Design an enzyme around this catalytic site. Structure first.
Site, short mmCIF file in Angstrom:
data_model
loop_
_atom_site.label_atom_id
_atom_site.label_comp_id
_atom_site.label_asym_id
_atom_site.label_seq_id
_atom_site.Cartn_x
_atom_site.Cartn_y
_atom_site.Cartn_z
N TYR A 1 -11.32 -7.67 -8.43
CA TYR A 1 -10.39 -7.10 -9.38
C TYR A 1 -10.29 -7.86 -10.69
O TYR A 1 -10.07 -7.26 -11.73
CB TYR A 1 -9.00 -7.00 -8.77
CG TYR A 1 -8.93 -6.09 -7.56
CD1 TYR A 1 -9.92 -5.14 -7.32
CD2 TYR A 1 -7.85 -6.14 -6.68
CE1 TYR A 1 -9.85 -4.28 -6.25
CE2 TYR A 1 -7.76 -5.28 -5.60
CZ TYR A 1 -8.77 -4.35 -5.39
OH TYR A 1 -8.68 -3.49 -4.33
N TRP B 1 -3.82 -10.19 1.13
CA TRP B 1 -5.27 -10.20 1.22
C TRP B 1 -5.73 -11.33 2.12
O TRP B 1 -5.11 -12.39 2.15
CB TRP B 1 -5.89 -10.37 -0.16
CG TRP B 1 -5.89 -9.12 -0.99
CD1 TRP B 1 -6.55 -7.95 -0.73
CD2 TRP B 1 -5.20 -8.92 -2.23
NE1 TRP B 1 -6.32 -7.04 -1.73
CE2 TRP B 1 -5.49 -7.61 -2.67
CE3 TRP B 1 -4.36 -9.73 -3.02
CZ2 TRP B 1 -4.98 -7.08 -3.86
CZ3 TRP B 1 -3.85 -9.20 -4.22
CH2 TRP B 1 -4.17 -7.89 -4.62
N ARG C 1 -1.72 -2.76 -7.14
CA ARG C 1 -2.31 -3.97 -6.59
C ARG C 1 -3.27 -4.64 -7.57
O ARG C 1 -3.11 -5.82 -7.92
CB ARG C 1 -3.07 -3.60 -5.33
CG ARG C 1 -2.32 -2.62 -4.48
CD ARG C 1 -2.00 -3.27 -3.16
NE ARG C 1 -3.21 -3.47 -2.37
CZ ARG C 1 -3.30 -4.34 -1.38
NH1 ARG C 1 -2.26 -5.11 -1.07
NH2 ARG C 1 -4.43 -4.43 -0.69
N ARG D 1 0.88 -1.17 0.00
CA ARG D 1 0.00 0.00 0.00
C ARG D 1 0.91 1.22 0.00
O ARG D 1 2.01 1.16 0.54
CB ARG D 1 -0.88 0.02 1.25
CG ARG D 1 -1.83 -1.15 1.35
CD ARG D 1 -1.24 -2.27 2.21
NE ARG D 1 -2.09 -3.47 2.24
CZ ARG D 1 -3.40 -3.44 2.46
NH1 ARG D 1 -4.02 -2.28 2.68
NH2 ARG D 1 -4.09 -4.57 2.47
N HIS E 1 -3.83 2.22 -5.29
CA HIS E 1 -4.12 0.79 -5.45
C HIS E 1 -3.97 0.28 -6.86
O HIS E 1 -3.95 -0.93 -7.08
CB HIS E 1 -5.53 0.48 -4.98
CG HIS E 1 -5.61 0.04 -3.56
ND1 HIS E 1 -5.02 0.75 -2.53
CD2 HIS E 1 -6.17 -1.05 -2.99
CE1 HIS E 1 -5.22 0.11 -1.39
NE2 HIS E 1 -5.92 -0.98 -1.64
#
Ligand SMILES: [Mg+2]
Ligand SMILES: [Mg+2]
Ligand SMILES: [Mg+2]
Ligand SMILES: [Mg+2]
Ligand SMILES: [Mg+2]
Ligand SMILES: [Mg+2]
Ligand SMILES: [Mg+2]
Lengths: 321, 322, 322, 332
Positions: free
Chosen positions: A304, A295, A272, A153, A269
């Site tokens: 996603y 996760w 990611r 992050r 993000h």
DNA sequence: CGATAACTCGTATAA
DNA sequence: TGTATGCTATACGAAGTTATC
DNA sequence: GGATAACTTCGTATAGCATACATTATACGAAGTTATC
DNA sequence: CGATAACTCGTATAA
DNA sequence: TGTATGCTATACGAAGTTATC
DNA sequence: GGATAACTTCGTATAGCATACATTATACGAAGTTATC
């Protein structure tokens, strides 16, 4: 009367939360008091009848369901931490929230996510920015390398600092990820840059001179002349990092619309999500992916990659045989 | 109160409805909470919220692990709720201080540890290294490690296996029936299956040990300096010994462990569990499949048990390097 | 009472927090109840146990189905609990008579009816038989039957689809987005993908009717005698119409619906679901994959969606004769 | 019916309630009543013997009774049945139920643990798989005895359709039709649930059809379409059709038992259950046979009317087909 | 125009 | 429509029945 | 009358399911309603 | 008869 | 040892800042 | 001096995610125990 004491203790250990929570607690209490004193309502203790009218108001203001939830949510936390009845335990409030959620989603509201920053985007961006010499086009290209290679992050990439960095006999770096943000850190306790991404980060390490002091934050500010200003007291704000994403996107697709939509250009993000989507296309098992990202839920990941051709469903397979 | 002293007498009378480990810790935390409570002149029961907060903080001060402290706050709670009295955690004072402590200690750079992995790698090695021995001690430990790794069963669970719990599949593979685990206690049990390779390792331990003599004998037992296995059907090898089999087998390939006084410096009871958990993830086994193997009910835990690859790692790194 | 008048009022207030059909059915039941209540000189609220029982017994009398009777009892309960009073079902007399009436009707002969299947086999036919037609509605309908079978979506769900809810995979497959279904209401929603063949049947109807001239247009709209579309963004195609399409397409092949009065005598709204549920079963699709395809989250509803192969059936017969 | 709800013990509305229960007595399965009455008798007698008031039940006594049942060495599932019936009695009569109090809840939990730690495990029916049916057939297909023909048709149908013995005893001639294929098809009206998860008709293979057809044309059950498919056969080997009396499920269990006796002999001397085929034997074996031939869990479950996977899994748990992921990894 | 293709209700029943 | 668990089947030794040897 | 094959009935012991709860959808014949033909 | 291999208990911490 | 829902963190336009240009 | 580049600092709007609850088990050094060498 007694609540006042609760409140004092509630404060005595304000350390039990994130500055980020307190931000919203206050940010909403504000909005609450505001609305009350303008409608003639005791903002505290809040009466379920009032809150209802309030929540119903935020809906009229155009706010998303998730936000109305944060408002009602913080309102609760405030009352619970004072030996008081939380407005959600009232038959009127929970009744309108169910009204609203349906009303809104039914009206077409819909939740979005970051714009993917896939592999194809790292290569394109690596191209035009690769042969640059500017003490910035370097820093940026190394931040992008880390973003996509550790799925960390942004707030995590910021806290990284030379000490943390080490090397593998393979000839690749290894960012130690000390000071997690969870007791049981679902992601590793060590992220390892690839080969290329290692080289790319080194380039920045020299040209920056952050090397000197080890307590120095890997990433830092870089003024209009082209000279980095390492530090070990202040870290490159998350906002800046977001910009680094924003900028790079603009450098390839122009500017955003006149519209007000969110996620029109890469964000924190974006790495990611892209990272996830690529591993998917590759064939990485959900468990391997979920971890590579740190996760814990499995839906977030399926979110996603819900539009890949691999995750189309059984019926499709059946029809094409 | 009348009901309070009645709720407690009820619980003590049927204390066996709880794990003996729950009792051991209820008692340990109590004396510890009483000690401090006296040498501070406070009522230890019913506990006063403001006193518990002090105690919890005194524990943080003592330098105890976040979890260790929650365990303390945990028994205290169970004691009150099983009594019928409100619990310490029902007060913002205790409720919040607990979080504050979890928050602080984490930032101060503290995280929970987990057993040193015992993976396939390590198994193949420890096997080919003892594979040929003719000592009772060795033959045994090699089977203990095979089951430990193959089944992911916890040491407690392994210690209870009795010869009568063992049967076979039509193809020759062994099957162990497990009744009580850490999270399950039914008469349906669950059947953990062995590979052709491991199944043989147990067979060799079975004959060399003579434990099939009484179907009620436990699968594993002691072996004395003379090299003779002493089977029993009322005394099972202690989980302390199984942890020993692990430490020793590690002190055997890596010899003497550090002087750090740190935990998990050598293989421990959970090592094969976490080790196998890794190997599967790494082999692409699905979430459900990794769950039946470990006896886990939700992705939540499974994921926790993963801290995965490092060296060149795998996944992303393995993806960038064309 | 006084509060009851309130709780009932708040209930009516945000009456939108509930399903439209839920309210529709509440009233309908209270009308049937009030009616019988008056003609029998009994109060209608609070409904006293015995009365509620004489009534439920009355509905069994009037020849109604079990499922229908429970609905009445169920609405009667919602009204009572939602207003703060104990449910008539909370009474030993009502909870029992209900079980009894079910037991008796089942034990007699009564059984639950299911929609008449619309399997892949039926799709191919209806396709190679309309596939070529250039009619504006013959094109729409085939695009509807495509989506229904391919996505298993319920008619009310298909009727709410807007062009803006459509997107595509790189492989070029349509990927409709659903937001509100019978089982969930959230901004997250789920995405149902169509096959290449079926994505095609839609790409066509979209042009041939130009609903694609306003993103907020409902993918499916009515057609008039002349064979001209009729896009909209304020009017969905009635679900009654969708139920019609199915019958119509059934007529087109099996003539007229025999006069027997019974239901499910020809394809209807759910036929695509059951049909697809079945075809997936035979094909050997897994439980987690079927649940995923139909929006079910439990094994005990999917199984519920089956009563498989007739005649030479399969499995056991295939097994023996083999 | 019940023991004897006291002249002065059963007081007030517990009389109103208990009265309403017997009014809608038809609200429960006949077997349910069977068990309620059996437990009450069992508790009632235990109470007399131990000087306790049997109703309402005092928690402390219910507890002494549960520790009693355990000491008598009964299974946990059984002890659970006893507390269960007791709870139903109390609840369905207005009084708070045992197991609604610390004493009983804690003791119950303790008994469960202590007993599992003692090695007590749930048993299931001995399987009757294909290879068993084929052997029984190879032997009984040459017998002209009316009884043997019946039995073989029975076994054939049990294995082929996976129906419960209570359902086989209800098949009646008129429920049989023919498939264009030339094999029988049994409709199953009077199912067990409102929603019959098992289907509405079962198809018998060609060979099993032959088996059944021979029972029909030698028993003469066709004479009245309303006759039950199966029926008695006496000393003299002569069938005796009926459209009013079906074979007891006890008798069906008797066919399985006997057939096992024929091939494997007299039953062992212990007292264990499942030492010879029983009523569920075909269901189990069939689940296994299908698992081995690669059938989807969903397809299996439907073939047998199962709705909860846990059960069929309990049946195929020891097949090599279900050894796990760790076995695969270990075996390269 | 009037006749027609093509589409809001209330009760009953399944998800 | 999800699904724990309260209702509902089967197990089986032994006693009671009825038509046949 | 007896003895006996072959059941049925019983009652207790255990295995194996199926429903209550609280809504939310669909089914479908009959009226009501527009724009075409 | 020691000396030695091979095995309860209390606090601490992960599952 | 599990998971509904209650904390936490990103998103971003906009207003302050501070060394270069 | 005045005009930026490149950032911090905010406050509000949303996305993401991970933990209290209540046990139950493992860690591991010390001290204790028993056949054996
Ligand atoms: Mg706690
Ligand atoms: Mg019975
Ligand atoms: Mg066999
Ligand atoms: Mg025979
Ligand atoms: Mg046998
Ligand atoms: Mg299988
Ligand atoms: Mg006899």
């Amino acid at each position: 009367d007694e609540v006042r004491k609760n409140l004092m203790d509630m404060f005595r250990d304000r350390q039990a939360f994130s500055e980020h929570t307190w931000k919203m607690l206050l940010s909403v209490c504000r909005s609450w008091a505001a609305w009350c004193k303008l409608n003639n309502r005791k903002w505290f203790p809040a009466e379920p009848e009032d809150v209802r009218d309030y929540l119903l108001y935020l809906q009229a203001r155009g706010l998303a369901v998730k936000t109305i939830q944060q408002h009602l949510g913080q309102l609760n936390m405030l009352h619970r931490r004072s030996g008081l009845p939380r407005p959600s335990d009232s038959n009127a409030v929970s009744l309108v929230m169910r009204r609203i959620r349906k009303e809104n989603v039914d009206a077409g509201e819909r939740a979005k996510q970051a714009l993917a920053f896939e592999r194809t985007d790292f290569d394109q961006v690596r191209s035009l920015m690769e042969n640059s010499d500017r003490c910035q086009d370097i820093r940026n290209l190394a931040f992008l390398g880390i973003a996509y290679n550790t799925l960390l992050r942004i707030a995590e990439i910021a806290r990284i600092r030379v000490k943390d960095i080490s090397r593998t006999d393979g000839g690749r770096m290894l960012i130690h990820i000390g000071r997690t943000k969870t007791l049981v850190s679902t992601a590793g306790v060590e992220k390892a840059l690839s080969l290329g991404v290692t080289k790319l980060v080194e380039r920045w390490i020299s040209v920056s001179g952050v090397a000197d002091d080890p307590n120095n934050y890997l990433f830092c500010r870089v003024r209009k002349n082209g000279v980095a200003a390492p530090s070990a007291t202040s870290q490159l704000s998350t906002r800046a990092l977001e910009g680094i994403f924003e900028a790079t996107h603009r450098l390839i697709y122009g500017a955003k619309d006149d519209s007000g939509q969110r996620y029109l250009a890469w964000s924190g993000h974006s790495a990611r999500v892209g990272a996830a989507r690529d591993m998917a296309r590759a064939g990485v098992s959900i468990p391997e992916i979920m971890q590579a990202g740190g996760w814990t839920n499995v839906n977030i990941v399926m979110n996603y990659i819900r539009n890949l051709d691999s995750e189309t469903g059984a019926m499709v397979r059946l029809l094409e045989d």
